[PDB]
Every structure is written in structure tokens, then in C-alpha cells.
Amino acid sequence: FGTNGFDIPTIAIALLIVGVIIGLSGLILSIFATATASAISNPSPGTLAYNLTHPLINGMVSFFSFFPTLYVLLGVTGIVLIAAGIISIIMEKF
Amino acid sequence: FGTNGFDIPTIAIALLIVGVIIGLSGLILSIFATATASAISNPSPGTLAYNLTHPLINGMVSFFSFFPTLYVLLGVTGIVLIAAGIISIIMEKF
Amino acid sequence: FGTNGFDIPTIAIALLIVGVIIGLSGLILSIFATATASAISNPSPGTLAYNLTHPLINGMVSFFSFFPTLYVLLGVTGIVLIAAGIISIIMEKF
Amino acid sequence: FGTNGFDIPTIAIALLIVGVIIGLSGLILSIFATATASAISNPSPGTLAYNLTHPLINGMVSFFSFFPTLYVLLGVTGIVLIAAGIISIIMEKF
Amino acid sequence: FGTNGFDIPTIAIALLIVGVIIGLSGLILSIFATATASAISNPSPGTLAYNLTHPLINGMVSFFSFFPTLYVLLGVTGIVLIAAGIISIIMEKF
Amino acid sequence: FGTNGFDIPTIAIALLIVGVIIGLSGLILSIFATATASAISNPSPGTLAYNLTHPLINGMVSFFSFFPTLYVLLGVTGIVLIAAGIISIIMEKF
Amino acid sequence: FGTNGFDIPTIAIALLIVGVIIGLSGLILSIFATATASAISNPSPGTLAYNLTHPLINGMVSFFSFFPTLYVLLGVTGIVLIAAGIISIIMEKF
């Protein structure tokens, strides 16, 4: 069901794949992050270990705040692909 | 039953395929998402794990809100295909 | 699901990998730094050992303060990659 | 009764096997865990043996709380397999 | 009685086989589950054995609740097979 | 019941094995640690034997506090394995 | 009366054998246990012999409470065997 490489079943299967992979990503990362939170302690506000450890957790927080927009762009990509498929169909189907 | 590659039985079979695949997609994703929801807990509003985990679930929500329009476009594609078939029939059938 | 090398599943898997690796980095470094903090003592403010040891801990502090911006840039890189993928799709998909 | 490797009798037999194995797993683990609970005592809240033993039982509890989601995913897998079988039948049966 | 591989007697025999296998599955699993229920006891709501054992029975319950939809899909498969047979007959019988 | 090496019965048997081994580990270590606690005495807070013995018990305590996170990671590993199996099934089952 | 190794007379004879052996087991064990009960006395609740002897009778009680489920599983096995025989008959008898 298509013209050259645009196959609606193929597209649906691909969407299947990305959705399940993303669900698993969220699952694994949340579970692992829970363990991370459990492991690290809070030594003191101003002792040596604080100086040694604080920037690391800051970098953690930063990267994880970067994740959402990555996901948003990844989602946006599919609309572009489906649109290109539609236009390619229209161009030479007539 | 057609002219070159437009076969009404073929079209019906293809519609069959996309419909069943989409039903299965919804089924699997809903079932898996239920497990995801069960797995992740709500630690606290402001502790370390919250900072570590909140953006992930935000990205989850965003992508899943992106799904519907993808499905709508996928559905729209078939009307275009059937239309092109009709026009191609008309062009050289007379 | 892509054109030449841009595969949304591949991208999601890669994000998976970087996230888990970074979580483990934070975990290991925090745990090891706790041991470092435990090991070194505070001899005195002005004796020989102080002269011998203070610059080392200063260098420690400096490098660990350098980490966060490294992480921020690493996070920024992915948006660039996804953007290039989008543009490459658009260029020849039409 | 099938096309290439999808055999409904084979599937039913496989389900048989997983179900009985899982029942036996629950049986054996529960019985053994009862013996474990009987064996270990509660020395005191703060003596040496408490320091020596508490983290072990904590790890026990953690792993056993990890079991349920493992089982849930294992169960989910079969729906995926049956779905793939259905789709494979449909693809070339017509 | 057929064209290439679609034989109504063969189909009836296959249905025979799946039905009897499924009946036996239900029989064996119910009988074994009765023994499982008899074996495991209820120690206490909050003691060590409870922590040690509860997630296992939870996983049991989950998987067994997953069974029904597996059976439903397995049943659905046969209608698809018979339909494909009918269509294949019609295609080249005329 | 699988595609290449992913076998649900095999997975269940493996889970069986890890669970029983971990239960036995907890059992043996707790029993042995009880004997350790019984054997060592508390000489005095400041005599020679105290200087000679205290760091050893400190190292004991440290390592045993390290155990729990080891167990947590070990548990996390299985979810990853089952996920990879699911994705591998999905990739070429369609 | 069978196909390859499934012989209803053979099965009946085997059932004969297991039943009589189990009856004799119960007989001998009950008779011997009566003698055991007669032999051992009850010295006192707290004297030396009590410390020396109580765990032994506890182990006796435990093992004998383990017997019933062993018997139940042994009984379950025969239904499985007869079922496999039925299915094997059906498979190639047609």
C-alpha cells in the first residue's frame, strides 16, 4: 500500500517501535535514578565532601532538564516524515 | 479488477492490515503504559529524586500527546491514495 | 524509519545509553569522593603537612567545579544532532 | 495448523509450560523464604550483629520487590508474540 | 477436499487438537494452583516473612490475569485463517 | 517459544536460579555473621587490643553497607534484559 | 492397545503399583513412628536433656509436615502423563 517506499503498515509498525522504546527508556531511567538518589547522601553544607560532590549532582540535574526538549523534537520529526510522504504521493500519483 | 495497479480487493486487504495493526498498537501501548505507571512512584515534591525524575515523565507526556495528530495524518493518507486511483482510472479508461 | 542514517529508534536507543552512562558516572564519582573525603585528614593550619597537601585539594575542587559546564555542553550537542537530522530529512524528502 | 512456524497447538503448549514453571517458582521461593525467615533472628537494635546483618535483609527486600515488574514484562511478551503471528499470517495468506 | 493446502477435514482435526489441549491446560493449571494455594501460608501482616513473600504472590496474580487476553487472541487467530482459506479458494476457483 | 535465543521458559528458569541463590546468600551470610559477632569481644575503649581491632570491624561494617546497592543494581539488570528481548522480538517479527 | 508406548493396560498396572507402594509407605511409617513416640521420653522443660533433644523432634515434625505436598505433586504427575499420551495419540492417529 504505497508508491515507492511509503507504506502505511510500515509507518504504523515504526511508530509502534518508537513508542515502546520510549516507554522503556522512561521506565529504566526512573528506576535507576531512584537507586542513584538512594545511594548518595547529604554530608553537610560546607564540609569537604560537599565541595567534592555538589557540582556532580548539579550536572545531573542540568542534563536531565535537557531531556524534555530532545523528546519534543524527536516527536516533531514524525509529522515531517508523514508530510513528506503525503506530498510525494500527490506529486506523481496524478 | 483494475487498470494497472489499482485493485479494489488489494485496497480492501490493505485497509484490513492497517486497521488491525493500529488496534494492536493501541492495545500493546496501553498495556505497557499501565505497567510503567505502576512501576514509577512519587517520591516527594522537592527532594532529590523529584529533580532527577520529573523531566522524564514530562517528556513521556509530551510524546504521547504528539501521537494523535500522527494518527490523524496517517488516516488522511488513504483518502489521497483512493482519490489518485479514481483519477487514474478516469484518465485513460475513456 | 528514516532516509539514510537518521533513525528515530536508533536515536532513542542512543539517548538511553548516554543517560544511563551519566547516571552511573554520578553514582561512582560520588561514592568514590565520599571515600576520598573520609581518607584525608586536616592536620593543622600552618604545619608542614598543610603546606604539603593544601594545593592538591584545591586542584580537586577546581576540576570538579569544571565538570558542570562540560555536562551542559554534552547535553547541548544532542539538540544540534536532532536538528541536523530534521533539516536533512526536509531537504530531499520533497 | 499454520503457515511457517506459527502453530496454535505449539503456542498453547508453550503457554502451558510457562504457566506451570511460574507456579512452581512461586511455590519453591515461598517455601524457601519461610525457612529463611525462620532461620535468621533479631539480635538487638544497635548491637554488633545488627550492624553486621541489617543491610543483607535490606537487599533481600529490595530484590524481591523487584520481582513483580519482571513478571509483568514477561507476561506482556506473549501478547507481542501472538500479535506478530497474526500479522504474519495476514500478510501473505492473501 | 480443497485446492492446495486448505482441507476442511484437516481444519476440523486441527480445531479438535487446539480445543483438547486448551481443556487440558485449564485442568492441569487449576489442579496445580490448588496445591500452590494449599502450600503457602499467611504468616502475618508486617513480619519478615510477609516482606519476603508478598511480591511473589503479587506477580503470580498479575501473570494469571494476563492469561485471558492471550486466550482471546489465540481464539481470534482461527477466524483469520479460515477467512484466508475462503478468499484463496475464491480467487482461482473461478 | 521465541525467535533466536529469547525463550520465556528459559527466562523464568533463570529468574528461579537467581532468586534461590540470593536467598541462600542471605541465609549463609546472616548465620556466619552471627558467629562472628559471638566470637569477637569488646576488650576496652582505649587499651591495646582496641587499637589493634577497631579498624577491622569498621571495614566489616563498611563493606556490608556496600552490599545493598550491589543487590539493587543486580536486580535492575533483569529489566534491561527482558526489554532487549522484547525489542528484538518486535524488530524482525514483523 | 496403543500406538508406540502408550498402553492402557500398562498404565493401569503402573497405577496399581504406585497405589500399593504408597499404601505400604503409610503403613510402615506410621507403625515405625508409633515406636519412635514410645521410645523417647519427656525429661523436663529446661534441664540438660531438653536442650540436647528438643531440636531433633522439631526437625522430625518439620520433615513430616513436608511430606504431604510431596505426595500431592506425585499424584499430579500422572494426569500430565495421561494427557501427553492422549495428545500423542491424537496427533498422528489422523
CA-wise closest residue to A79 among B24, B3, B74? B74
> Under a CB-based contact definition with an 8 Å cutoff, are residues C33 and A23 in contact?
no
Question: A26 with B56: CB under 8 angstroms?
Answer: yes
Residue F90 has its nearest CB partner, among A16, A27, A38, at: A16
Helix A48-93 and helix C8-39: axis angle, to 10°? 180
Helices G48-93 and E8-39, axial angle in degrees (round to 10): 170
C-alpha D28/C-alpha E16 separation (Å) is: 35
The answer to whether C31 faces chain A, any CB pair under 8 Å, is yes
In terms of Cβ atoms closer than 10 Å to its own Cβ (0-12, 13-18, 19+), residue E39 is middle
Instruction: Check if the beta carbon of residue D67 is closer than 8 Å to that of residue E59.
Output: yes
Give how far D19 is from chain E: nearest CA, Å. Answer: 7
Residue D86 to residue E80: CA distance in whole angstroms = 8
User: D34 near E47, Cβ under 8 Å?
Assistant: no
CB contact under 8 A, F89 and D77: yes
CB pairs under 8 A between B and D: 28
Q: Is B46 helix (H, G, I), strand (E, B) or coil?
A: coil
Size of interface A-C (CB pairs under 8 A): 136
Q: Any CB–CB contact under 8 A between D25 and chain F? A: yes
Q: Which residues of A touch F79 (CB under 8 A)?
A: 27-28, 31
Q: Which of E76, A34, C61, G67 is nearest to B47 (CA)?
A: A34
User: What span, in angstroms and rounded, lies between the C-alpha atoms of A53 and A38?
Assistant: 15
| Residue D90: CB atoms within 10 Å | 19
How many CA atoms within 13 Å lie on the side-chain side of E8? 4
Q: Give per-residue burial for B79-90: e unless 16+ CB within 10 Å, then b.
A: eebeebbeebee
Inter-residue contact B17 to A9 (CB < 8 Å): yes
| Angstroms from B63 CA to nearest CA on chain A | 6
What secondary structure, in 3-state letters, does G30-86 show?
HHHHHHHHHHCCCCCCCCHHHHHHHHHHHHHHHHHHHHHHHHHHHHHHHHHHHHHHH
CB atoms within 10 A of CB C70: 11
A15 contacts in chain B (CB < 8 Å)? 25, 67, 70
A8 sits in which H/E element: helix A8-39
Please name the residue of chain B whose CA is at the shortest distance from the CA of residue D68: B39
Cβ-Cβ contacts under 8 Å for B38 (sequence gap 6 or more): D69, D72
Q: How far is F60 from chain D (nearest CA, A)?
A: 8
* Span between the terminal Cα atoms of chain D, in Å: 16
* C-beta atoms of D67 and E59 within 8 A: yes
Closest CA of chain G from E90, distance in Å: 28
**In this complex, do G87 and E13 lie within 8 Å of one another by their Cβ atoms?**
no
Is the CB of A56 less than 8 angstroms away from the CB of C26? yes
| Resolution, Å (one decimal) | 4.3
Cα within 13 Å of Cα(B63), Cβ side: 29
Q: Is the Cβ pair D36, F19 closer than 8 Å?
A: no
User: Could you give the CA distance from residue B47 to residue B66 in angstroms, rounded to a whole number?
Assistant: 30
* Cα–Cα distance, C73 to C60 (Å, whole number): 21
Q: Does chain B reach chain D with at least 3 CB pairs under 8 Å? A: yes
The answer to whether F17 contacts chain D (CB < 8 Å) is no
Annotate D25-80 with DSSP letters as a single string.
HHHHHHHHHHHHHHH-----SSSHHHHHHHHHHHHHHHHHHHHHHHHHHHHHHHHH
Give the distance, in angstroms, between the CA of residue E28 and the centroid of all CA atoms in the same chain: 12
> Which chain B positions have a beta carbon within 8 Å of A91's beta carbon?
none
CA distance A21 to F87: 7
CA dist D1 and D54 (Å) reads: 56
Q: Does F64 touch chain D (CB under 8 A)?
A: yes
Q: Do chains G and F touch (3 or more CB pairs under 8 A)?
A: no
Mind telling me how many Å the CA of D61 is from chain B's nearest CA? 16
Look-up of cell digits 565538570: C67
In angstroms, rounded to a whole number, what is the distance separating the alpha carbons of residues C16 and C19?
Answer: 5
CA distance G4 to chain E (A): 19
Pick from D76, D86, D91: which is nearest to B32 by CB?
D76
Report angle CA A65, A66, A67 to the nearest 5 degrees.
90
Method: cryo-EM
Cα E70 from Cα D75, distance rounded (Å): 9
DSSP B43: -
* A7 chain-C contacts, CB cut-off 8 A: none
Among chain E residues, the shortest Cα distance to G83 is held by E24
How many CB atoms are located within 10 Å of the residue G30 CB? 9
D70 touches B: beta carbon within 8 Å: no
